[PDB]
Amino acid sequence: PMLKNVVVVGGGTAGWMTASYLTAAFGDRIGVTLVESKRVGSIGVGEATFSTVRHFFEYLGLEEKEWMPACNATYKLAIRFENWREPGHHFYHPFERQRVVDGFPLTDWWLREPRSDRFDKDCFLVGTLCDDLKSPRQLNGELFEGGLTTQFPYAYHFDATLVANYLRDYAVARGVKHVLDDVQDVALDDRGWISHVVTGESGNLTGDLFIDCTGFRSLLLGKALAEPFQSYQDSLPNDSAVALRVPQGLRPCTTATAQEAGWIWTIPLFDRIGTGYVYAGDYISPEEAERTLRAFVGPAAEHADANHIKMRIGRSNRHWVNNCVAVGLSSGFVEPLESTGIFFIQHAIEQLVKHFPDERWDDGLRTAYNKLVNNVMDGVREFLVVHYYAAKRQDNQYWKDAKTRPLPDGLAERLERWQTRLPDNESVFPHYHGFESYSYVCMLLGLGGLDLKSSPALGLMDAAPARHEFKLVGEQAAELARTLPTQYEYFAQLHR
Ligand SMILES: Cc1cc2nc3c(=O)[nH]c(=O)nc-3n(C[C@H](O)[C@H](O)[C@H](O)COP(=O)(O)OP(=O)(O)OC[C@H]3O[C@@H](n4cnc5c(N)ncnc54)[C@H](O)[C@@H]3O)c2cc1C
Ligand SMILES: [Cl-]
């Protein structure tokens, strides 16, 4: 007794990732309909991704060389953090797993005896590749790792509208019914379950399962079903953004430049730059934020229209209620400091397939699904609070307040453990939330606000293997700088 029809409401990145993934997972064995407005646009942002996104394209059977040119896409090997510790300081948060020497990470050996003033230069390859604007692939397509299960779980930058167009064509070609219309009413039955959605001129769209991809407005879950929403704003005050699209070497990383009341993203696409100021409206006005952003970008922004966005920061109490699942901004959101919006969508849809119901609608599937999503969002929220707490700067009220806001449960205890020994698998938020322990280590070392200590055991061990590893990183960096093409060179002859 299996379900027969899914209705997806919304045609942004969330809706078309949902629809395309459903056809990849279930084929023609279930019907999928997507309805989307002709007049309400998508949010217009969401252009950097997280490590897991490679597996989304793999699941659909899409190779980089076919979708990347069609989506204005580049590689994201890291995030470059600027001015978080102090003025003029920068460091990389790379998609690069730790090197472990005799049971201890190289970063631990570094902390014992720093080889330079840059932990990321000494311990990692990827930051240097970003500085040299390198492609992660040689001109013959082979990944650089093969010349040294991957140590480099990288991601992408792309135009979210082009990706959504690409997945729409992917999904419609595989039988997804596409309705271009407004949902004007969500009809509930006597159980409070969704019976159908009423469209302006396409009749009623009926189905067994309804996916709310309507964005922040959450027309099905938050509005029609009145599901409570849990704000994160007390712990993360950034509630606003102003975004620009700007004409444009391609640095394979996102840049996050701390500002007086937030931070500015720089996302390099193949032929343009996406940039925006994420800020706290209680500290600066939208006018000041736009002024700051335009001055930061410089003359290239003098003719670009600013896109002002109010963010709904938090998560729904439940994400799957009755026969309705929220995917995308309707489900939850944190500021894009670590590029988690599309990660949340992929997690939501992957776990919806894994917990997909039959006609018995086992409530335990909902309970498990909701716990998984809540744990992912709570964990990312904790990770982001650490960004502001561990940022060394306390130069104004905003950056002082970043250390006195209420911490999520358990973070105070974890902060104390991290100042005893660097974070590892057993000293971070103990549920899946995307980020691995190496991300915590890098952020703490770069942000520089905590009192970090190396493990005393290192003093009783042979330092030779660690010294060899540091030397090896330098040799491999030198070889990669000589051989890898620049990212522009790579895409220039790939766009042939
Ligand atoms: C400033 C900012 C920066 C971000 N940066 C990143 C980033 O770097 N990386 C990342 O991964 N994510 C990022 N995100 C998150 C990202 O934008 C979302 O995860 C993603 O775009 C999915 O959005 P959505 O589809 O849920 O909502 P939307 O894009 O708002 O889509 C809503 C859809 O519902 C439709 N709709 C609405 N009402 C109706 C109706 N009545 N009837 C029919 N259809 C309707 C609309 O037409 C639209 O198609 C960012 C978000 C913001 C605000
Ligand atoms: Cl995000």
Author numbering: 0 to 147, 161 to 260, 266 to 513
Sentences from the paper on this structure:
Orthorhombic AbeH crystals grew only in the presence of FAD and crystallized in space group P212121 with two AbeH/FAD complexes in the asymmetric unit (ASU). Density for FAD could be clearly seen and modeled in both chains. A Cl– ion was modeled in each chain in a strong spherical density peak 3.2 Å away from the re-face of the isoalloxazine ring of FAD (green sphere in Figure 2A,C,D); if this peak were modeled as water instead of Cl–, difference maps showed residual positive density. The isoalloxazine occupies a hydrophobic pocket with the re-face packed against η6 and the si-face covered by the closed conformation of the flavin binding loop (located between β2 and α2). FAD makes hydrogen bonds with backbone atoms of Ala47, Ser 356, Ile359 (isoalloxazine), Ala13, Ile42, Leu346 (pyrophosphate), Gly10, Gly11, Ser36, and Val195 (adenosine) and 12 water-mediated hydrogen bonds. The Cl– forms ion-dipole interactions with the backbone amide groups of Thr357 and Gly358. Lys75 and Glu352 superimpose with the catalytic Lys and Glu residues identified in other FDHs structures. Both chains in the AbeH/FAD structure have a disordered region (Gly148-Gln160, between η3 and β9 in the box subdomain), which in other FDHs forms a lid over the Trp binding site when occupied. The orthorhombic crystal used to solve the AbeH/FAD structure crystallized from a solution containing AbeH, FAD, and Trp, but there was no density observed in the Trp binding site. When these structures are compared to PyrH/Trp(2WEUA), it can be seen that closing of the flavin binding loop in AbeH/FAD causes the Glu46 switch to flip, closing the Trp “gate” by pushing Phe49 and Ser50 into the Trp binding pocket by a backbone translation of ∼3 Å and side chain rotation, obstructing the space occupied by the Trp β and α carbons and carboxylate in the PyrH/Trp structure.
